[PDB]
């Protein structure tokens, strides 16, 4: 087909332009900066109330409350200062794979292997926790869901498309298509304007929330992309693959910046998060550990090893105080 | 000390009690995961048990001889199995369905799927129950057509029993760890008590083996 050859020529032109726009890599610029050595963190608290594997976790906006999702059909809200249980919500479908906490603190969303995203309201006048909405319309499993303004929620599924829903009416306001494989994770921008998503076909796409069209795409990996997160500046992001490699992509340069890998590590990443200053990059691995990389030099700076199974979820507070990790051993851990 | 936090601690303790009770109530049910090929009698097997929204996973709940069985049918997913198959790492048993009525090389792809699911890195120590269900018209099929089309190396008679045994051993030879797993085989039909009793016996055997492995004696 002539269109296939035209597409190949256009891709070659894009690659040539990307190469031409390049310069000396980030290593040359950051060679002379001071490093940070032995970033040692010790477990402060230990939240033990779950009875099965733990698949998701999200920090509250006040940096004190958090929510965790288990496979026994439980969504638990923890107070991170006294290790107390504020709420324990039982779920209709035990096969969950994600959770989110509203930026105002009123709603919590959970989804999973039943093609439905449930939304629960916390502050009612009867004292209990009621289910507020049940968004349905996806064909594959829900992989990750995030809140925007307590009325709009963006979800990602395992059917190559990710949707944007208006909660009050209950229907897909917008749909985003363009991946070939499953979509595994997404992270909203700090200003909630754009958002990136990683797919199970070794590509990451940047979408504009309004007007609903794919803006950019990046391809540097060799296997599935299993986690993704925005740099706090909002002008870069970090992708964690399934072949023991992390990468830092730039929106404006539209190509790769640096890669984080080691010969000793051969497992697959499961979560990625940053620090308030954008200097430390955490990474939850599959070999029971949790590495802490110096994002400006690629040299490893610390190890968090306290878990008896693979670490599945990882998060950092808004003010930058603590770090929460959660694994398949049914224990969360707060590090500081 | 604490001034108003004592009531919060009391709330947390009651919550912990409720979770422990719910967990110990929910950890008494035998988990079975159902797998098969296209229209391979999975609906018939599901209906034969004693016994819109949520299109993905269909959970059936039944009870036989004071044992509470819970079966997950996940055939209506249509996505990569390698991304969500590890959720079922703790299932007690795996039921597999195969239609003996072989027409376009369905046996080869069924064997491929069985090889992929039997040797998976997650389903070690998990026994596999196997049903060969479409046996009512298998004798008609073999008398109207020979089995050498599926297996050119086949060098046996065209009788029902020998062909059935050949297919059964062909499926059972895909196992790699003959010492860890234990494949059970059954030829099911419009009969029901045989199916439920076979599932019950296999579940009892694997339960006994798991108890022995737990108590150190294994």
């Amino acid at each position, epitope marked *: 087909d002539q269109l296939r050859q035209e597409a190949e020529q256009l891709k070659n032109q894009i690659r040539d332009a990307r190469k031409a726009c390049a310069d000396a890599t980030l290593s040359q610029i950051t060679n002379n900066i001071d490093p940070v050595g032995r970033i040692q963190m010790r477990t402060r608290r230990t939240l033990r109330g779950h009875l099965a594997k733990i698949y998701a976790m999200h920090w509250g906006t006040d940096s004190r409350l958090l929510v965790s999702a288990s496979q026994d059909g439980k969504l638990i809200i923890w107070d991170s200062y006294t290790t107390n249980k504020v709420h324990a919500i039982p779920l209709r479908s035990s096969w969950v794979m994600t959770c989110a906490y509203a930026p105002s603190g009123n709603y919590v969303a959970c989804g999973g292997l039943d093609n439905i995203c449930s939304i629960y309201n916390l502050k009612t006048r009867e*004292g209990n926790v009621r289910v507020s909405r049940e968004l349905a319309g996806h064909t594959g499993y829900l992989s990750c869901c995030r809140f925007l303004d307590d009325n709009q929620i963006v979800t990602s599924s395992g059917d190559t498309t990710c949707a944007l829903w208006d909660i009050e009416t209950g229907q897909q306001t917008t749909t985003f298509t363009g991946h070939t494989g499953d979509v595994m994770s997404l992270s909203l921008a700090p200003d909630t304007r754009l958002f990136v998503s990683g797919a199970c076909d070794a590509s990451a796409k940047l979408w504009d929330v309004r007007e609903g069209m794919c803006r950019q795409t990046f391809t540097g990996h060799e296997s599935d992309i299993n986690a993704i997160c925005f740099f706090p500046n909002g002008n870069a992001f970090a992708t964690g693959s399934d072949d023991a490699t992390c990468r830092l992509f730039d929106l404006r340069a539209d190509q790769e910046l640096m890669t984080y890998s080691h010969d000793n590590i051969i497992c697959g990443i499961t979560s990625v998060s940053f620090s308030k200053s954008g200097r430390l990059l955490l990474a939850g691995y599959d070999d029971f550990n949790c590495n802490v990389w110096d994002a400006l030099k690629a040299d490893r700076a610390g190890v968090l090893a306290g878990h008896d199974n693979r670490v599945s979820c990882l998060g950092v507070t808004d003010d930058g105080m603590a770090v929460a990790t959660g694994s398949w051993d049914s224990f969360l851990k707060i590090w500081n | 000390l604490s*001034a108003e936090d004592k009531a919060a601690v*009391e709330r947390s303790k*009651m919550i912990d009690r409720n979770l422990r009770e719910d967990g110990e109530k929910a950890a008494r049910e035998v988990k079975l995961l159902l797998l098969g090929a296209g229209e391979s009698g999975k609906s018939t097997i599901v209906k034969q048990m004693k016994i819109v929204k949520t299109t993905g996973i269909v959970e059936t709940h039944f009870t036989f001889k004071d044992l509470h069985f819970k079966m997950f049918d996940v055939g209506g997913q249509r996505s990569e199995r390698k991304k969500w198959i590890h959720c079922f790492e703790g299932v007690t048993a795996i039921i597999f369905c195969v239609a003996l009525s072989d027409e376009m090389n369905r046996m080869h792809e069924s064997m491929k799927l069985f090889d992929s699911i039997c040797n998976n890195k997650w389903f070690t120590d998990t026994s596999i129950i196997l049903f060969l269900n479409k046996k009512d018209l298998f004798e008609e099929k073999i008398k109207k057509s020979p089995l050498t089309i599926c297996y050119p190396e086949y060098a046996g008679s065209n009788t029902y029993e020998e062909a059935a045994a050949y297919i059964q051993c062909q499926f059972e030879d895909l196992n790699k760890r003959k010492d860890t797993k234990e494949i059970y085989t059954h030829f099911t039909c419009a009969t029901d008590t045989k199916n439920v009793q076979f599932v019950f016996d296999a579940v009892t055997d694997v339960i006994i083996k798991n108890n022995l492995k737990d108590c150190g004696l294994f």
Partner: single-chain antibody
Amino acid sequence: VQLVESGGGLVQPGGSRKLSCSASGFAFSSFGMHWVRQAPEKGLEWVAYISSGSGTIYYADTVKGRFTISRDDPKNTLFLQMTSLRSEDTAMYYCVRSIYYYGSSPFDFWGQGTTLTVSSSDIVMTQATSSVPVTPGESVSISCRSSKSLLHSNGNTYLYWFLQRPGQSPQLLIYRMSNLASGVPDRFSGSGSGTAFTLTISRLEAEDVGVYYCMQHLEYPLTFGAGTKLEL
């Protein structure tokens, strides 16, 4: 939400009487319950506490050993049994609910009260002012004082501002000195520190006329004290 109670009336000295409080419209089995009485022409005073799950019960030093509180979850009813009534126990009673977790708001709904006529170390808090003459459209301030500091090591003070307009039950205005309760106009505000507290109103209408009470929740027993009165 409804917390309607009954059982009061005319009794004799040395008798006994049971009060019942029937709750409908909320998850009753998750709320701690208080009783609060009020004598004629006087202020509010705490009586009794039963927590959620009946694992903690508190009484007042003036009635300990004579009153007994209990709850019934499946029937959703709060019972209080009273023995050896004296002439001082003539008053009108309120059934109150409260739920404690992080960020909650106790004392958020009061009942309707029942009358009871019988024929014939603790923290003390003072509202020196008894009445204030006001006209609509202006701004007013009310002050409350306590013997010891209410600030705790956690960092949150325990002060509650209630309003009682005439002919009705009290209503929660402010909890923990700075948090506005649900369904409350933004005009009201609270501030202060240590042992001095101030509740300010920016504009006044015909609905903001009544008595104002301050309470502390630092330790039991709970002490209200007399209340400032506003009128036009």
